[PDB]
Design a protein around this ligand. Structure first.
Ligand code: HEC
Ligand code: HEC
Ligand code: HEC
Ligand code: HEC
Ligand code: HEC
Ligand code: HEC
Ligand code: HEC
Ligand code: HEC
Ligand code: HEC
Ligand code: HEC
Ligand SMILES: [Ca+2]
Ligand SMILES: [Ca+2]
Ligand SMILES: [Ca+2]
Ligand SMILES: [Ca+2]
Lengths: 441, 441
């Protein structure tokens, strides 16, 4: 596998050039600053430190390098996070998987990978670049992540038997999914064995009593959702009609000399409306943008109501622990909080949900609300048995920075450490990669 | 106005015959039997006695005659309900409105109308049959209910200025809407002044402190939703694309001799798929029925979770009243129950919601859940201050008949009175109507 994408700029100029252009999509928006409530709901987990909205594929490697979530490893065995964090960021992951094998790849801390995983998300992620057919300009789409191949099988869709159009969406489905870390090596695995609906994955995580972390306010064993667009897309009316991710996000387009190719500048479809929705819809651009924005507002409105409930629940649960509640007394409440938050998180962890499957988004939040209702109703009784009967009062969480101080984060300290790491360690990584010829000189 | 529909059978055979055929749609399904939870939620209101799903237009008059809800008037001034209950059932309503004027029509009890309102929902409800153009076989659509005309104005769409296709949906919008009874005469009025969304109508009813009834379990001043398909259709993706009620429910169709006309057998569109959906869709019948049925199950699943919460809330509120809670103490809880149930009710009072605007149905239920959550959380605290800290236990409500006994209904007594009334008073009404030539001999 060839991870150095430049290698391919000469044979495949139109793709290389449009691919490279995702660097223009560089706005990196602080999702926590926008919704400080998230810091409470993720108390005790790295997402409470740093969580931004997605940007261009071109920023993948640098963004995982720079999140507060990966911390500031002193050495190849240090740092909070495992090798698996590289998995969906670079074609060097494919290199390493074929070089050291999967287990070899997953072994160790993220930091171990720093001077190995250096090329931007690119050609060998989606393409079997080895094939002689690829130089000839045929796609030769492939799944380069074996854990993604397994999952497509688990879901009844073995890649190599799927038709061309299913395969298009599956390449995106290598990374744009909900996943968890499986086993002591912490390998990536999509929780799809029982299906891809919220309640499927819920029972699945429960069969194996898995938790991503324990919320540090309520002591609840939490599950974390991550960007489930593949699951959520297939549930939506476009996916039911086999409108693929490529149909909206990678439209066929023309050379300055009318040669047709696929736009690799993967971004917002509305930017190229004539070449995307317009292919299948007669409504004009402003009409369709308007509909989409209404679904975004609806979901956001309900989204915040659920989040407000969960903020009350985590702090009520803390008030109960402080009042001497025992584990047996907390366990049913924690079950409800775990379930409520999982449904909420999965509902909105994809920033596309209002477009891909707005009605599933709304449905998940409704069922999140049902569990949050139970959680807080059980807490009001529990606290009563402890002699407390007033409303539990929440610290000021009107800003990201207040919410972070409120759950005990030393943000200056944390940012200082990260800034020191970025400034000094990353350039060491790139110099090592150059010497080893992993990175273009 | 000509309320005797037969009058028109000779000039307009294809319409008359298909119109008459809604009598084939005669299955009258007991909605209460299916969901006994409704009896609790409507405790103290007529809907807790009798509530069926819709059937054919041909059964409108007889169904309003036979519901337990209209009771068994001893005379023209007796009975629980007003004249307004006739409003959306018969073209004799249009007769009376033009003959006695609107105020004259609304004055009095339902019972007063019994020998006056006797023809089936029909031609003069939707058509200006007076127009010479109508005999010539032009539609000459009209709004025969002035309170419907006002509402279309209130919504920025004066009928006579709307285009042909908006007008099609507006005739259905004379009856298929959420309404309330305004003033001492209890005239029909659509609560559309602030718009037709759930939150519009909610603030609207609140501005004027209106209540339909007080739930007899929780003493909450309740609002009742009714079949808001007009409002809900305009909100959905088909209405946004001006697919009219006629496009799915009254398809254009062909004579045995290829004369084209509009099917007046108003029923389920799927029955005539080749002539309805198929006009605009390429998916086949089973594919589209399958989608529609999934949305129906999603909504029904959420629907029952909200209902269960509201059942708990009404009985918890009762427990609190029983424990001595004062009005000041109850008022904030009652506000939340009123709001929660209103959002739920409006979300599912239309049996078409999963088809017309599934996502607005889901959304409303989500916001119903948020208020139900607040209601029960405040109740748990209120009860605590009364020395109660255990879960409030709910009577057995597993059947319609159990739930009805549980809220204090004497159903045998009620049914016996109704049965007596139907057997003896109705045939008197029809004989009077014949003698006055209101009803075909
Ligand atoms: C595929 C299964 C992934 C694994 C494993 C990890 N990430 Fe990821 N990440 C993935 C996608 C598809 C996206 C974009 C969509 C989205 O909703 O964000 C991302 C994005 C990020 C970002 C940028 C945004 C942000 O959160 O600031 C960061 C910083 C990031 N990912 C970090 C990260 C870490 C630290 C991981 C190891 C736990 C990790 N990702 C794994 C897909 C996948
Ligand atoms: C996934 C995120 C991709 C990355 C990274 C790259 N390509 Fe791609 N490419 C992708 C898809 C989904 C498709 C279309 C397949 C189909 O069935 O239509 C393609 C296609 C190509 C082609 C074929 C010609 C064409 O349709 O334009 C070429 C020559 C190609 N891709 C080249 C290419 C190069 C050089 C890349 C690295 C810079 C690269 N692709 C990355 C998806 C993805
Ligand atoms: C793992 C190798 C990925 C594959 C395969 C695909 N995407 Fe991706 N995507 C990935 C990451 C890590 C990120 C976040 C980048 C960051 O640094 O923040 C993304 C992001 C997107 C976005 C958002 C773009 C923006 O400007 O905001 C989109 C629209 C997107 N990805 C689409 C997409 C499609 C359509 C894919 C299949 C061809 C696809 N991605 C594959 C990682 C990976
Ligand atoms: C058209 C029917 C689409 C298909 C098929 C897919 N996506 Fe999409 N996506 C679409 C739109 C219109 C938007 C933007 C919504 C808006 O408010 O403008 C998106 C967005 C995304 C994003 C996030 C973008 C961001 O926050 O920067 C991602 C990560 C994304 N889409 C992924 C994605 C994948 C993986 C798909 C195949 C499973 C896919 N989309 C299909 C429209 C459409
Ligand atoms: C063909 C490959 C499509 C492209 C490209 C886009 N859409 Fe689409 N859309 C498509 C189908 C086949 C359908 C189902 C209706 C039908 O014609 O049978 C739709 C439906 C929608 C809807 C309504 C459903 C809903 O989710 O509420 C919307 C709002 C919609 N499509 C939006 C949309 C946008 C914004 C697109 C460009 C980003 C777009 N579609 C592209 C097929 C296709
Ligand atoms: C229009 C503004 C109406 C007024 C005023 C009343 N009703 Fe009605 N009713 C209306 C529609 C559009 C429908 C069918 C749709 C639906 O969801 O039911 C009905 C149906 C009935 C039925 C049949 C089903 C049932 O509940 O058993 C009955 C018995 C009925 N309506 C009774 C009724 C009474 C007693 C009224 C006065 C309070 C009344 N309706 C007013 C529209 C309208
Ligand atoms: C509303 C529930 C209606 C009732 C009751 C009746 N008609 Fe109707 N009719 C209705 C609509 C919505 C339309 C279509 C208008 C359009 O723009 O296409 C019609 C049309 C007719 C016509 C016109 C010819 C045609 O398109 O078939 C005729 C001759 C007609 N209607 C006759 C008719 C008679 C005789 C009725 C009482 C038995 C009657 N209609 C009732 C809606 C409604
Ligand atoms: C008041 C005069 C009405 C107008 C105008 C329209 N409808 Fe109606 N509809 C009305 C009632 C009172 C009822 C319930 C009948 C009963 O006795 O239960 C209904 C019912 C329907 C139904 C359900 C039919 C079934 O078989 O279950 C549908 C599909 C329906 N109505 C459609 C409809 C359309 C499309 C209209 C505009 C042309 C329309 N109705 C007008 C009362 C009135
Ligand atoms: C196609 C896009 C439709 C339009 C436009 C309207 N309706 Fe509809 N309606 C449609 C379907 C497919 C169904 C049945 C759903 C199912 O599960 O099979 C319905 C149903 C109704 C009903 C209730 C039927 C019943 O319970 O017997 C009513 C009262 C109804 N529809 C009313 C209605 C009105 C008033 C409309 C214009 C505002 C309207 N529908 C448009 C499909 C479509
Ligand atoms: C033209 C007058 C239509 C008729 C008749 C029916 N539908 Fe439709 N539908 C129509 C449009 C213009 C759209 C929007 C997408 C697009 O092509 O631009 C749709 C969309 C749908 C959808 C997807 C949206 C959603 O609500 O989830 C479904 C599921 C759908 N339509 C179903 C449907 C059925 C069951 C119909 C017969 C009862 C039907 N449509 C008729 C236009 C028209
Ligand atoms: Ca973005
Ligand atoms: Ca996860
Ligand atoms: Ca029916
Ligand atoms: Ca009402």
């Amino acid at each position: 596998v060839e991870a150095k994408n430049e290698t391919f700029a000469p044979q495949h100029p139109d793709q290389y050039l449009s691919w490279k252009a995702t660097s223009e999509q560089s706005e990196r928006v602080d999702a926590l600053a926008e919704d400080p409530r998230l810091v409470i709901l993720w108390a005790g987990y790295p997402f409470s430190r740093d969580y931004n909205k997605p940007r261009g594929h071109a920023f993948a490697v640098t963004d995982v390098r720079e999140t507060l979530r990966t911390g500031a490893p002193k050495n190849a065995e240090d740092g909070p996070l495992p090798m698996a964090c590289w998995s969906c960021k670079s074609p060097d992951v494919a290199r390493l998987i074929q070089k050291d094998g999967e287990d070899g790849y997953f072994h160790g801390k993220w930091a171990r990978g720093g001077p190995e995983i250096v090329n931007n998300l690119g050609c060998a992620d989606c393409h079997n670049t080895a094939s002689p057919e690829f130089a000839k300009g045929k796609p030769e789409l492939t799944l380069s992540r074996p854990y993604a191949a397994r999952a497509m099988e688990a879901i009844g869709k073995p890649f190599e038997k799927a038709g061309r159009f299913d395969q298009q969406s599956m390449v995106c489905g290598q990374c744009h999914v909900e996943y968890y870390f499986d086993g002591k090596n912490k390998a990536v695995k999509f929780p799809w064995d029982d299906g891809m609906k919220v309640e499927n994955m819920e029972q699945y995580y429960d069969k194996i009593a898995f938790s991503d972390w324990t919320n540090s306010l309520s002591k609840t064993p939490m599950l974390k959702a991550q960007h489930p667009e593949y699951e959520t897309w297939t549930a939506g009316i476009h996916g039911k009609n086999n409108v693929t991710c490529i149909d909206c996000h990678m439209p066929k387009v023309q050379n300055a000399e009318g040669k047709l190719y696929t736009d690799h500048k993967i971004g917002n479809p509305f930017d190229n409306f004539a070449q995307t929705c317009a292919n299948c819809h007669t409504q004009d651009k402003a009409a369709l943008q308007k509909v989409v924005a209404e679904r975004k507002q609806s979901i956001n409105d309900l989204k915040i109501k659920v989040e407000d409930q969960l903020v009350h629940a985590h702090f009520e649960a803390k008030a109960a622990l402080d009042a001497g509640a025992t584990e047996a007394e907390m366990k049913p409440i924690q079950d409800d909080i775990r379930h409520a938050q999982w449904r909420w998180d999965l509902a909105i962890a994809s920033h596309g949900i209002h477009m891909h499957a707005p009605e599933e988004g709304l449905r998940m939040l409704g069922t999140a609300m049902d569990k949050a209702a139970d959680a807080r109703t059980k807490l009001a009784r529990l606290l009563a048995t402890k002699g407390i009967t007033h409303e539990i009062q929440i610290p000021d969480i009107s800003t990201k920075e207040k919410a972070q101080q409120a759950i005990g984060l030393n943000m200056e300290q944390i940012k200082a450490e990260k800034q020191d790491f970025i400034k000094t360690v990353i350039p060491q990584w790139e110099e090592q990669a150059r010497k080893n010829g992993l990175l273009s000189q």
